[PDB]
Design a protein around this nucleic acid. Structure first.
Ligand SMILES: *C[C@@](*)(O)[C@H](CCCNC(N)=[NH2+])NC(=O)[C@@H]1CCCN1C(=O)[C@H](N)Cc1ccccc1
Ligand SMILES: *[C@@H]1O[C@H](CO)[C@@H](O)[C@H](O)[C@H]1NC(C)=O
Ligand code: NA
Ligand code: NA
Lengths: 249, 28
DNA sequence: GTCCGTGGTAGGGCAGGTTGGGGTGAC
DNA sequence: CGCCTAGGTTGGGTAGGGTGGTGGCG
């Protein structure tokens, strides 16, 4: 997270840490949608270009954390994966289209004051909040520039018009992703960076005062660059998929 | 799942975080 | 108005599955 | 006894803290 700031303890209780067992290094971010289902970016588990391909037994999940490194006793809860589910349409070669994936925990997690699930959006919530100018919140223990934060970072970024998003990168944009961030003449700055992938792009509904995950930190050219913007996976367009996956398994 | 989007140290304590409003004030 | 499947990220086989819908639709 | 900064699946913020039970020093 670039041009962000220290998060308020318990302000992102759905924030999950995708931790690699050996070597013990922070891999990506993720969101807690239920007691046994965690949502993250597919490119975090499978990205051949960097010979990246992890199995359930290779990864660890840390929930309710605020400190990036230190083990937060009696607060932090660690769970392990039973199965990984990467969308069959995930295109890792060209434009990381549908850069989403579900992770099923082996044992249900116990909710606390630091551990709680985020809401998935319905077609109505998605039709009200998904608009240019409408600001969303992004969190993660990713790089501060192109170094590493002490505690969880948070930044507020507005949704950008699709045309601007498209003409800002040479990559081919799809209906399964949206770009967010400030423009050059807007004065304010901020953006996500490496290690923030899988992190949620939540928005608070002014109709039921509930936080909804609308996007997933996917890709972007560099970090916090002028003219360039960060892209997030369109959660709603895939909910249908999420629903029947969590259902059948 | 039916109690989602409600933080126990905020919404459930009728308290706001310091940057929330920025988000709500962006709806025009 | 039109377009969003038969290989692509990839098998087997032309549907449909965890996948080809639908939408802030884009053009 | 109050200061001082400290291991662990773990910093130093302080011996509680969003969490246990722990010292050495002057
Ligand atoms: C895996 C994530 O941690 C990371 C997040 C990047 C977010 N950047 C900004 N500014 N918010 N994602 C990546 O690094 C992705 C995955 C692998 C390649 N990648 C990129 O961003 C490339 N640099 C660009 C790209 C490559 C291929 C297809 C689409 C985009
Ligand atoms: C990733 O690893 C798994 C487990 O070994 C393997 O079955 C699968 O074929 C690999 N996928 C790629 C794209 O390399
Ligand atoms: Na197919
Ligand atoms: Na301690």
């Amino acid at each position: 997270i670039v041009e962000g700031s220290d998060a308020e303890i318990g302000m992102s209780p759905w924030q999950v840490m995708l931790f690699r067992k050996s070597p013990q290094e922070l891999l990506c971010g993720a969101s807690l949608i239920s007691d046994r289902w965690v949502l993250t970016a597919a490119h975090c588990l499978l990205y051949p270009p960097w010979d990246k391909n992890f199995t359930e037994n290779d990864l660890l999940v840390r929930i309710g954390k605020h400190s990036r490194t230190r083990y937060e006793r009696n607060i932090e809860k660690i769970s392990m994966l039973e199965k990984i589910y990467i969308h069959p349409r995930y295109n890792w070669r060209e434009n990381l289209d549908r850069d989403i994936a579900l992770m099923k925990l082996k044992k249900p997690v116990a909710f606390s004051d630091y551990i709680h699930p985020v809401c998935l959006p319905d077609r109505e919530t998605a039709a009200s909040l998904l608009q240019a100018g409408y600001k969303g919140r992004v969190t993660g223990w990713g790089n501060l520039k192109e170094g590493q934060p002490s505690v969880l970072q948070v930044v507020n970024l507005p949704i950008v018009e699709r045309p601007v998003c498209k003409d800002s990168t040479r990559i081919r944009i799809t209906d399964n992703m949206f770009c967010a961030g400030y423009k050059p003449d807007e004065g304010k700055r901020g953006d996500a960076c490496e290690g923030d992938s899988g992190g949620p792009f939540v928005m608070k509904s002014p109709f039921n005062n509930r936080w909804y995950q609308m996007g997933i930190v996917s890709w972007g050219e560099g970090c916090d660059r002028d003219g360039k913007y960060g892209f997030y996976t369109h959660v709603f367009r895939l909910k249908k998929w999420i629903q029947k996956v969590i259902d059948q398994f | 799942e039916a109690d989602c989007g409600l933080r126990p140290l905020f919404e459930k304590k009728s308290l706001e975080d310091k940057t929330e409003r920025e988000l709500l004030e962006s709806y025009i």
